[model samples]
Target: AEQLTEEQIAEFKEAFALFDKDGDGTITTKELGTVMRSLGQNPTEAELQDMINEVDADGNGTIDFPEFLSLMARKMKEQDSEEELIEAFKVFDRDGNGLISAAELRHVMTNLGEKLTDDEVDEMIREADIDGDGHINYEEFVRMMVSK
Candidate 1:
């Protein structure tokens, strides 16, 4: 697995803080919604609910730091190759939205024979959801997905 350096971890934390809009030590719909809006998605209620159902641990309707960390760790373990990552990203971008929601990600994992805990999934989401939009943009997605 590829471990991030201290500086990279610091950058990741900054990104995490930005996603945790409520600052209640967790990231909620509002925070992700803001990010989605920033990504020009403005996800619907169904979309929001789906994302929460897929990524929020404890079913509390939000993702805490620990939960997010778990998700990232799991993803790091599953991320074996650049091609796999690219494929995963594409499959998650259902409806050709060019962006992926946590729901889409959950579904993708389920279908890919890889089950991820919500916390782990959320952590992965935070990492892959570049552009600070609660979703993974195509450009950034491809960059990371294809990284060597």
Candidate 2:
């Protein structure tokens, strides 16, 4: 088991908060999908099923924070570093508004070599553009970028 640094711990905690949507003390596939959507990734239903089968040890179709942490650690152990965390924050902090918006997400995704079709971009914007002002605030942005 790899030990997490302070930064990853903070990031994980934030992600956990966002993922526990119902605060039912567990996370379902729906919550995980929501998390993935925020990060600009949407898993197929089949993929989600597979994830549950592999990660949800209790077979309850829900994963608690500890399970979620284990899954995150397995996926990110090699990448969990201060530099990476800061870089993620920087990439997500688009518009230089000291905050993030859907526009920022589009820009960041584009910059990261993911040239989204306008339609795809629009979809992302609609999904992540929380304030319904056609934009995402910093809180929304960070939640998507970090947790997703």
Candidate 3:
């Protein structure tokens, strides 16, 4: 239930085939590194091996088409979610210094939707500002967004 379209699945298969250099139905970290390096990403061998091993959910000690699809879909989902998080944060992070200032938060909180009191804005920042910086940075924003 990875929830990919037929076209997406086919696309993953095409990329997977490129990595399965031996054409023997499976892939190795060495082979993957060669292909990835050619694509201008000089990933570490250790990183490549870690990714390959994690994708091999069948415990086969190697990567097949299905596992490659898993890796592709997971990476795609992660990128999608991160884009969403950034877009959502940008809505509140006015002036965009990579941090949400108290003044910006106040403007947003009261200027739109139901107007809230000044104390409420302070309280909201206190709850999310883990580092006590009096501002919500991207890390704080992500933590707040991801946490229940």
Candidate whose lDDT is highest: 3
In the range 1-148, model 1's lDDT, one tens digit per residue, is 6656778667767777888876677787777888899988889877888887776778878888767776776766677565576676677788787788777777788998989887877888787665687777777677765561
Q: Cα deviation in Å at residue 53, candidate 1? A: 1.6
lDDT of 3: 0.85
lDDT of each: 0.76, 0.74, 0.85
Q: Which should have the higher TM-score, number 1 or number 2?
A: 1
Query: Top model by TM-score, which number?
Result: 3
Tell me how many residue pairs clash in candidate 2: 0
For model 1, the local distance difference test gives 0.76
lDDT of 3 by residue, 67-144 (tens): 777777789889999999999789889998888987788888776775767788888899999888889998899999
Runs in model 2 deviating more than 4 A are 1-11, 80-148
Candidate 1 TM-score to native: 0.47
